[PDB]
Amino acid sequence: DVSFRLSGADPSSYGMFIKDLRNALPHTEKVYNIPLLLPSVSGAGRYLLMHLFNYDGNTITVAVDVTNVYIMGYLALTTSYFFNEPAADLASQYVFRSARRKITLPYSGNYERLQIAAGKPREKIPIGLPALDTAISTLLHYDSTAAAGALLVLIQTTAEAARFKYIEQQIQERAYRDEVPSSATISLENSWSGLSKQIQLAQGNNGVFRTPTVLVDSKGNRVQITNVTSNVVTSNIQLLLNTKNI
Numbered sequence: 001d002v003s004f005r006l007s008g009a010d011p012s013s014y015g016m017f018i019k020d021l022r023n024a025l026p027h028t029e030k031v032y033n034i035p036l037l038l039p040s041v042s043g044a045g046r047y048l049l050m051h052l053f054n055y056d057g058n059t060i061t062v063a064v065d066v067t068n069v070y071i072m073g074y075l076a077l078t079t080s081y082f083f084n085e086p087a088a089d090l091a092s093q094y095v096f097r098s099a100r101r102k103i104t105l106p107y108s109g110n111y112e113r114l115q116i117a118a119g120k121p122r123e124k125i126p127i128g129l130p131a132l133d134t135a136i137s138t139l140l141h142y143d144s145t146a147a148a149g150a151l152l153v154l155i156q157t158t159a160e161a162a163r164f165k166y167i168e169q170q171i172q173e174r175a176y177r178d179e180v181p182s183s184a185t186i187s188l189e190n191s192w193s194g195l196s197k198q199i200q201l202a203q204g205n206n207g208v209f210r211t212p213t214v215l216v217d218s219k220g221n222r223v224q225i226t227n228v229t230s231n232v233v234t235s236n237i238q239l240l241l242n243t244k245n246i
């Protein structure tokens with residue numbers, strides 16, 4: 001299991017949590033020096049438990065699929081919550097079995113359904129360490145609309161930060177003040193699968209992507225990523241979704 005405490009959190013302790021989260025994901029291979037997530041994992045071993053504590057020290061446990069970094073559900077006091085999608089229903093067979101009741105949330109876990117549920121796109125949802133503290137608090141008491149927004153915050157500040165060093169840095173910049181994600185952040189979130197696939201196909205194609213990936217950069221500019229010498233590949237992406245899962 002991996003843990004993070006919002007109480008006394010700073011950029012350093014958050015960086016340590018994101019390092020722990022990455023290190024908990026199993027790999028047998030690096031591709032271009034980036035850990036390659038596994039095709040699959042059987043049984044309870046598929047699911048990492050992240051213990052998160054809000055500033056008052058209350059806790060939720062979040063279940064994450066170690067093959068794709070996907071949050072499937074969470075436990076808050078004695079109630080488990082899972083997304084309404086087959087992968088989460090499978091996860092519910094393995095995690096939080098001792099919960100007194102299990103609620104299936106009225107949406108799946110993808111960004112499009114979550115944003116509909118929350119009534120806003122994540123371009124308009126501030127993120128950062130204070131927003132994460134809020135999100136943990138919200139999830140402690142079931143409110144499906146409020147929960148969607150909290151889950152958008154929670155996904156971006158954990159899974160998306162583990163996937164991309166740039167996103168981890170964005171959150172570190174937001175240690176004491178929330179701010180909506182940069183469009184570069186949004187771009188990366190949306191491209192992880194695409195990048196993961198192209199970095200794997202570059203192997204046996206002399207490091208050249210079969211299909212270029214279009215991103216937005218820091219200054220807000222729309223760039224084409226065509227080969228593994230890109231900074232996005234060398235110094236940003238931290239984990240690769242296995243093409244067997246794409």
Ligand SMILES: *[C@@H]1O[C@H](CO)[C@@H](O)[C@H](O)[C@H]1NC(C)=O
Nearest residue numbers: 208225226227228229230231
């Ligand atoms: C690869 O990417 C860079 C941009 O990052 C580009 O300028 C360069 O010409 C490309 N190299 C190859 C071999 O395609």
Ligand SMILES: Nc1ncnc2[nH]cnc12
Nearest residue numbers: 069070071109110111159
């Ligand atoms: N439930 C989830 N977990 C991790 N990353 C995601 N991106 C969109 N939905 C997600």
